[PDB]
Amino acid sequence: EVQLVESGGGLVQPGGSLRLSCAASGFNIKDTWIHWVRQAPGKGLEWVARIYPTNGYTRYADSVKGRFTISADTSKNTAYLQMNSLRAEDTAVYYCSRWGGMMFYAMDYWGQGTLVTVSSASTKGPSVFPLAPSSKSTSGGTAALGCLVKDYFPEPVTVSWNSGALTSGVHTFPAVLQSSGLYSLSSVVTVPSSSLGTQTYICNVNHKPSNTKVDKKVEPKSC
Amino acid sequence: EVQLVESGGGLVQPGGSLRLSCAASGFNIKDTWIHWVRQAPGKGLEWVARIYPTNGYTRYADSVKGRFTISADTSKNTAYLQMNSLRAEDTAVYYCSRWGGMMFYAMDYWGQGTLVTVSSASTKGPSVFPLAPSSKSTSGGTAALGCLVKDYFPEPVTVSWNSGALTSGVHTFPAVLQSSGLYSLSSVVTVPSSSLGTQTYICNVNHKPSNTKVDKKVEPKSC
Amino acid sequence: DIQMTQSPSSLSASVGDRVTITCRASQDIPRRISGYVAWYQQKPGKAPKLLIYWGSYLYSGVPSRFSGSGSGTDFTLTISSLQPEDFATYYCQQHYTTPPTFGQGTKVEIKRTVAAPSVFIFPPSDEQLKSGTASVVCLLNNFYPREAKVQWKVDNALQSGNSQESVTEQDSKDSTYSLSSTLTLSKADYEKHKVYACEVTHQGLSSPVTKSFNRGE
Amino acid sequence: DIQMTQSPSSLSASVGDRVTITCRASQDIPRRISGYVAWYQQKPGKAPKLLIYWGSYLYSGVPSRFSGSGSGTDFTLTISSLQPEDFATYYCQQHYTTPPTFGQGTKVEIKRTVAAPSVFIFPPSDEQLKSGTASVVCLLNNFYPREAKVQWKVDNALQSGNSQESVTEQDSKDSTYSLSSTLTLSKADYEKHKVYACEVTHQGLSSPVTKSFNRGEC
């Protein structure tokens, strides 16, 4: 029942600002220390800041000292990271965590994290295209299907299949940046070959930054 | 109503063992760190030990390692210091203290302290003799009277006047060790000359180590 | 400033192996100053999880195969019997200083037996081609080890420089990888050619596997 | 190992003065390693009380005249306007190391106006004499400064080496001291002599003051 949930991350122009929130439940933040830790894509963990909410005591990593401010509101049981003068190098997933039960020097609960992308590019939703085998393709009884989730920005996108009912054999590939400066990925799934043309397969794509959601039915092409 | 109260201190022979208790109220020792800190007579403070009762995590000062054991019984909300192989240099007032609610490195609540005296000398209760007022002995506009609390061991003794009803103008002197190896002190009070031979003055002496309590009436000596 | 030097930076071990990872302080540190070293495990797309605190204390709920130990400046995380689900990056953290710092991380991969990819090719959709571009995709599914080579040919012309690859994180149950290769062509170039082929070379394949289609079939 | 050096070890100051006490680390400590220095006040016969923690935070309910600061490995407790109730011994505590260590303490005395003592002499009780010993008590009450001299005479013979003194801690309200001098004689020696005298010398007295009694008179 102890939980932390971050919110407020998103796309922002360089030199801009953004405020992250960290809402607690199952515990009271006045009993704790709250911390923020970030992870640049592909990189390690980098402690950002901490606060003791009861008395306002804060400490920061050199890397953000003078641009970021960690604060908290004990009544909303919610902490914040105010980030000013953002730079490319601040692009990262931001996590909030705590110290629990007088057990200091141990971050025991963390949120899921929230991505902050520092860029001049504008948000753009994906186009979603079916990945279906050629009508003349053969198989040994297992066939692959997928969705091509092309030309979006920033990260992330999520993909499910058949509204979550199809999970086994699903691979959603890490996005790749194209030379255009837009992401693309594919999501694939392996299914019985006999079920093609009989069973419905829909990929459910959600690009929250652009509020773009698509449900694409994938079938082999009528020739 | 957060409170710590020590008990169990007293006179013990060199090489002997004693167990101190530290009983907590108004809070749960499971949500803290508990510390023992000691102070030899007229010296400074010496940290002795700490426990994190949830973990059982214990640390000790080098001066007590191997000899003392800190522990806690959370059902009793009470922490303990078991002291073995005692030495003269362990003579001290022992305090328990805590850190409160993730607020580490700050000993916010302390008990009143319990005195441990390591000595081969045996307990002995005091004799109580009047320091009688006289109508002919006025200085600075009052009379003065008191009780001489003589030939006791170990410390401490307490003295009140009129069961606590008389506090103004009382001085109870720090004890001095006599050449005999026994302590002695006087408690005095200045009073109106007009009260003499008409008001009752009683010193209440309690030497708990010997279970000695005496109420001594102090009056002018008959002339 | 004071730092932890984590080593090795990556490793691969079989199920059941005992694994040990090391964290070493950067400087000399005055006696009696404690670092209260913590170890965290981080799986892809998830927050780090606490394993060990104050050097040696197993955090509640964490399997007993994890243990920590310390002595001086040097700390060690030990996984006594590696499991498939222990694929992750492991980090130490030091609290000598405020702010504290993390080690660089150690990527743990699970070794397993060679497994050949299953290979599938996908033509571009008519919908995309309308917009001016053709993406052709090749999928290599559930293979080990991660290293694989994909070669694209269009009417037997080797394509060089116009494809991108993506690889999944190691699977937490079967310890395999999958990989996609996407070939980008203009709609004009796509329409000028017929045979589209993906050739895969992998340790698990005695010779390369080629999957193709013909445009318009 | 790492220790804190407290200075001065004692001081005396007037009501309203600004007092500043210093705590210095034993050695150089790597940068970034925090001391989380705490300050405690201890009054006679009481436990220490938390004043300041984490170098500069005021503990809840502690008067605002108390403040803490630091810079490097130097820390300061500051009393901005000294009050009579601030008589105490003040200690710093460092948490670079585990275990933490305390400063050696600073005793703060309150200076006030000279005050002469009131002086009383008390013969031994008949009840005491029964057991073979006579204690004679001289009381100096509510005086300042602490320094005082007591001389005992028995039939004009200066007593040397057979008395003990005790002094109270400085009073938290009026900043005065009181002192007892107790003379120990045998019952036989006591009964052999007549005139018992306590002579008190003190700054507040223009001439020494003598209080005496004649054994067997009233």
Coordinates of N, CA and C in Angstrom, one line a residue, chain B residues 37 39 42-47 50 57 59-62 95 99 102-112 128-133 136-146 148 150 169 171-179 186 188 190 216 221-223, chain D residues 1 36-38 40 42 45-50 53-54 59 91 93 95 98-100 102-104 107 117-129 131 133 135 137 139-142 164-169 171 176-180 182 184 211 217-218:
Chain B
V37 N 24.1 7.4 26.6 CA 25.2 8.3 26.7 C 25.5 8.4 28.2
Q39 N 28.0 10.2 31.6 CA 28.7 11.3 32.1 C 29.3 11.1 33.5
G42 N 31.5 15.3 37.1 CA 32.2 16.5 36.7 C 33.0 16.5 35.4
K43 N 32.7 15.5 34.5 CA 33.3 15.3 33.2 C 32.3 15.7 32.1
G44 N 32.6 15.5 30.9 CA 31.7 15.7 29.7 C 30.9 14.5 29.3
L45 N 30.3 14.6 28.2 CA 29.4 13.5 27.7 C 30.2 12.4 26.9
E46 N 29.9 11.2 27.1 CA 30.5 10.1 26.4 C 29.4 9.2 25.8
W47 N 29.3 9.2 24.5 CA 28.4 8.2 23.8 C 28.9 6.8 24.1
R50 N 24.2 2.4 20.7 CA 22.9 2.7 20.0 C 22.3 1.4 19.5
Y57 N 20.2 -3.9 14.9 CA 21.5 -3.3 14.6 C 22.1 -2.6 15.9
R59 N 25.7 -0.7 17.7 CA 27.0 -0.1 17.7 C 27.4 0.2 19.2
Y60 N 28.7 0.2 19.5 CA 29.2 0.5 20.9 C 30.5 1.3 20.8
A61 N 30.7 2.1 21.8 CA 32.0 2.9 22.0 C 33.0 1.9 22.3
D62 N 34.2 2.2 21.9 CA 35.4 1.3 22.1 C 35.5 0.9 23.6
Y95 N 22.4 8.2 30.8 CA 21.2 8.7 30.1 C 20.9 7.8 28.9
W99 N 16.9 9.2 18.7 CA 16.6 10.1 17.5 C 15.1 10.0 17.1
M102 N 12.8 9.8 11.6 CA 13.8 10.1 10.5 C 14.6 11.3 10.7
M103 N 14.5 12.0 11.9 CA 15.4 13.2 12.1 C 16.7 12.7 12.8
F104 N 17.6 12.2 12.0 CA 18.7 11.6 12.5 C 19.7 12.6 13.0
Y105 N 20.7 12.1 13.8 CA 21.8 13.0 14.3 C 21.3 14.1 15.2
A106 N 20.2 13.9 15.9 CA 19.6 14.9 16.8 C 19.0 14.3 18.0
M107 N 19.6 14.4 19.2 CA 19.1 13.6 20.4 C 18.0 14.5 21.0
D108 N 16.8 14.3 20.7 CA 15.8 15.3 21.0 C 15.2 15.1 22.4
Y109 N 15.0 13.8 22.8 CA 14.5 13.5 24.1 C 15.5 12.6 24.8
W110 N 15.7 12.9 26.1 CA 16.6 12.3 27.0 C 15.8 11.9 28.3
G111 N 16.2 10.9 29.0 CA 15.8 10.7 30.3 C 16.5 11.5 31.3
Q112 N 16.1 11.4 32.6 CA 16.7 12.2 33.6 C 18.1 11.6 34.1
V128 N 20.8 12.6 60.1 CA 20.2 14.0 59.8 C 20.2 14.8 61.0
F129 N 20.9 15.9 61.0 CA 21.0 16.8 62.2 C 20.5 18.2 61.9
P130 N 19.9 18.9 62.8 CA 19.3 20.2 62.5 C 20.5 21.3 62.5
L131 N 20.3 22.2 61.7 CA 21.1 23.5 61.7 C 20.1 24.5 62.1
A132 N 20.0 24.7 63.4 CA 18.9 25.4 64.0 C 18.9 26.9 63.7
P133 N 17.8 27.5 63.5 CA 17.7 29.0 63.4 C 17.8 29.6 64.8
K136 N 18.7 35.5 67.2 CA 19.9 36.3 67.3 C 20.9 36.2 66.1
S137 N 20.5 35.4 65.1 CA 21.4 35.1 63.9 C 20.6 35.6 62.7
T138 N 20.5 36.9 62.5 CA 19.8 37.4 61.3 C 21.0 38.1 60.5
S139 N 20.9 37.9 59.2 CA 21.9 38.4 58.2 C 21.2 38.6 56.9
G140 N 21.4 39.8 56.3 CA 20.7 40.2 55.1 C 19.2 40.2 55.3
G141 N 18.7 40.5 56.5 CA 17.3 40.7 56.8 C 16.5 39.4 57.1
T142 N 17.1 38.2 57.1 CA 16.4 37.0 57.4 C 17.1 36.2 58.4
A143 N 16.5 35.1 58.8 CA 17.0 34.0 59.6 C 17.4 32.9 58.6
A144 N 18.1 31.9 59.1 CA 18.5 30.8 58.2 C 18.5 29.5 59.1
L145 N 18.1 28.4 58.4 CA 18.1 27.1 59.1 C 18.4 26.0 58.1
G146 N 18.6 24.8 58.5 CA 18.8 23.7 57.6 C 18.9 22.4 58.2
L148 N 21.8 19.0 58.2 CA 23.1 18.4 57.9 C 22.9 16.9 57.7
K150 N 24.5 13.7 56.9 CA 25.9 13.4 57.1 C 26.1 11.8 57.1
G169 N 14.2 30.1 48.4 CA 15.3 30.4 49.3 C 16.1 29.1 49.8
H171 N 18.8 26.2 49.4 CA 20.0 25.8 48.8 C 20.4 24.4 49.3
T172 N 20.4 23.3 48.5 CA 20.9 22.1 48.9 C 22.3 22.0 48.2
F173 N 23.3 21.9 49.0 CA 24.7 21.9 48.6 C 25.1 20.6 48.0
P174 N 25.9 20.7 46.9 CA 26.6 19.5 46.4 C 27.3 18.8 47.6
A175 N 27.2 17.5 47.5 CA 27.9 16.7 48.5 C 29.4 16.8 48.4
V176 N 30.0 16.7 49.5 CA 31.5 16.5 49.6 C 31.8 15.2 50.1
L177 N 32.9 14.5 49.6 CA 33.3 13.3 50.2 C 34.3 13.6 51.3
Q178 N 34.0 13.1 52.5 CA 34.8 13.3 53.7 C 36.1 12.4 53.7
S179 N 37.0 12.7 54.5 CA 38.2 11.8 54.6 C 37.8 10.4 55.0
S186 N 24.8 19.8 53.4 CA 23.8 20.5 54.1 C 22.8 21.1 53.1
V188 N 20.0 24.2 53.2 CA 19.7 25.4 54.1 C 18.5 26.1 53.5
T190 N 16.6 30.3 53.9 CA 16.4 31.5 54.6 C 14.9 31.7 54.8
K216 N 12.9 15.4 59.4 CA 13.5 16.1 60.6 C 12.9 17.5 60.8
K221 N 16.7 26.2 69.1 CA 17.1 25.4 70.3 C 16.6 26.2 71.5
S222 N 16.1 25.5 72.5 CA 15.5 26.2 73.6 C 16.5 27.0 74.4
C223 N 16.2 28.3 74.7 CA 17.1 29.2 75.4 C 16.6 29.6 76.8
Chain D
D1 N 41.7 9.9 16.1 CA 40.6 10.0 15.2 C 40.0 11.4 15.1
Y36 N 26.8 17.3 10.3 CA 25.5 17.3 11.0 C 25.7 17.7 12.4
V37 N 26.3 18.8 12.6 CA 26.7 19.2 14.0 C 25.5 19.6 14.8
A38 N 25.5 19.2 16.0 CA 24.4 19.4 17.0 C 25.0 20.2 18.2
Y40 N 24.1 21.1 22.3 CA 23.3 20.8 23.5 C 23.7 21.8 24.7
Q42 N 23.4 21.9 28.9 CA 23.2 21.1 30.1 C 23.3 22.0 31.4
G45 N 22.4 18.9 37.2 CA 21.5 17.9 37.6 C 20.5 17.5 36.6
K46 N 20.6 18.1 35.4 CA 19.6 17.7 34.3 C 20.3 17.1 33.1
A47 N 19.5 16.4 32.3 CA 20.0 16.0 31.0 C 20.2 17.1 30.1
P48 N 21.1 16.9 29.1 CA 21.4 17.9 28.1 C 20.1 18.1 27.3
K49 N 19.9 19.3 26.8 CA 18.8 19.7 26.0 C 19.3 20.1 24.6
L50 N 18.6 19.6 23.6 CA 18.9 19.9 22.2 C 18.6 21.4 21.9
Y53 N 20.4 21.6 15.5 CA 20.9 20.4 14.9 C 21.2 20.6 13.4
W54 N 21.9 19.7 12.8 CA 22.2 19.8 11.3 C 22.9 21.2 11.1
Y59 N 16.0 23.8 17.3 CA 15.0 22.9 17.7 C 13.8 23.6 18.2
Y91 N 27.6 21.9 24.7 CA 28.4 20.9 24.0 C 28.0 20.9 22.5
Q93 N 28.4 18.3 18.9 CA 28.5 16.9 18.7 C 28.7 16.7 17.2
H95 N 28.9 14.2 13.7 CA 28.6 12.9 13.1 C 29.3 12.6 11.8
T98 N 31.0 7.5 12.9 CA 30.2 6.6 13.7 C 31.2 5.8 14.4
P99 N 31.2 5.9 15.8 CA 30.3 6.7 16.5 C 30.6 8.2 16.5
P100 N 29.6 9.0 16.8 CA 29.8 10.4 16.8 C 30.6 10.8 18.1
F102 N 31.6 14.1 21.1 CA 31.2 15.4 21.6 C 32.4 16.3 21.7
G103 N 32.2 17.6 21.6 CA 33.1 18.6 22.1 C 33.3 18.4 23.7
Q104 N 34.3 19.1 24.2 CA 34.6 18.9 25.6 C 33.8 19.7 26.5
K107 N 31.8 26.0 29.7 CA 31.0 26.5 30.8 C 30.8 28.0 30.7
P117 N 28.0 38.4 50.6 CA 27.2 37.4 51.2 C 26.5 37.7 52.5
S118 N 25.3 37.2 52.8 CA 24.8 37.1 54.1 C 25.5 35.9 54.8
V119 N 25.8 36.0 56.1 CA 26.7 35.0 56.7 C 26.0 34.5 58.0
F120 N 25.9 33.2 58.2 CA 25.3 32.5 59.3 C 26.3 31.4 59.8
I121 N 26.4 31.3 61.2 CA 27.1 30.2 61.8 C 26.2 29.3 62.6
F122 N 26.4 28.0 62.5 CA 25.5 27.0 63.1 C 26.3 26.1 64.0
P123 N 26.1 26.1 65.3 CA 26.8 25.2 66.2 C 26.4 23.7 65.9
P124 N 27.1 22.8 66.3 CA 26.7 21.4 66.3 C 25.4 21.2 67.2
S125 N 24.5 20.3 66.8 CA 23.4 19.9 67.6 C 23.8 19.0 68.7
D126 N 23.0 19.0 69.8 CA 23.3 18.1 70.9 C 23.1 16.7 70.4
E127 N 22.2 16.5 69.5 CA 21.9 15.1 69.0 C 23.2 14.5 68.3
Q128 N 23.9 15.3 67.5 CA 25.1 14.9 66.9 C 26.3 14.7 67.9
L129 N 26.4 15.5 68.9 CA 27.5 15.4 69.9 C 27.5 14.0 70.6
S131 N 27.2 11.2 69.4 CA 27.9 10.2 68.6 C 29.4 10.5 68.4
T133 N 31.1 13.4 67.4 CA 31.7 14.4 66.5 C 30.8 15.6 66.5
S135 N 30.1 18.9 64.0 CA 30.2 19.7 62.8 C 29.8 21.1 63.1
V137 N 29.0 24.7 61.0 CA 28.7 25.1 59.7 C 28.7 26.6 59.6
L139 N 27.6 29.4 56.7 CA 26.9 29.6 55.5 C 27.1 31.1 54.9
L140 N 27.5 31.1 53.7 CA 27.6 32.4 52.9 C 26.5 32.3 51.9
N141 N 25.6 33.3 51.9 CA 24.4 33.1 51.1 C 24.3 34.2 50.1
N142 N 24.0 33.8 48.9 CA 23.5 34.6 47.7 C 24.5 35.8 47.4
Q164 N 35.8 21.5 55.2 CA 35.5 21.3 53.8 C 34.4 22.3 53.3
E165 N 34.6 22.8 52.1 CA 33.7 23.7 51.4 C 32.9 23.1 50.3
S166 N 31.7 23.6 50.2 CA 30.8 23.2 49.0 C 30.2 24.5 48.5
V167 N 30.1 24.7 47.2 CA 29.5 25.8 46.5 C 28.4 25.4 45.7
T168 N 27.3 26.1 45.7 CA 26.2 25.8 44.8 C 26.5 26.3 43.4
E169 N 25.8 25.6 42.4 CA 25.9 26.2 41.1 C 25.2 27.5 41.0
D171 N 22.9 30.5 40.5 CA 21.5 30.5 40.5 C 21.0 31.0 39.0
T176 N 23.6 34.4 41.6 CA 24.4 34.4 42.7 C 24.8 32.9 43.1
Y177 N 25.8 32.8 44.0 CA 26.3 31.6 44.6 C 26.0 31.6 46.1
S178 N 26.0 30.4 46.6 CA 26.1 30.3 48.1 C 27.1 29.2 48.4
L179 N 27.7 29.2 49.6 CA 28.8 28.4 50.0 C 28.6 27.9 51.4
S180 N 28.9 26.7 51.7 CA 29.1 26.2 53.1 C 30.5 25.9 53.3
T182 N 32.3 23.6 56.4 CA 32.0 22.8 57.5 C 33.3 22.3 58.2
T184 N 35.0 20.1 61.2 CA 34.8 18.9 61.9 C 35.8 18.8 63.1
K211 N 31.2 35.9 62.1 CA 30.0 35.4 62.8 C 30.6 34.4 63.8
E217 N 26.3 29.2 75.4 CA 25.5 30.4 75.6 C 24.3 30.4 74.6
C218 N 23.3 31.3 74.9 CA 22.3 31.5 74.0 C 21.7 32.9 74.3

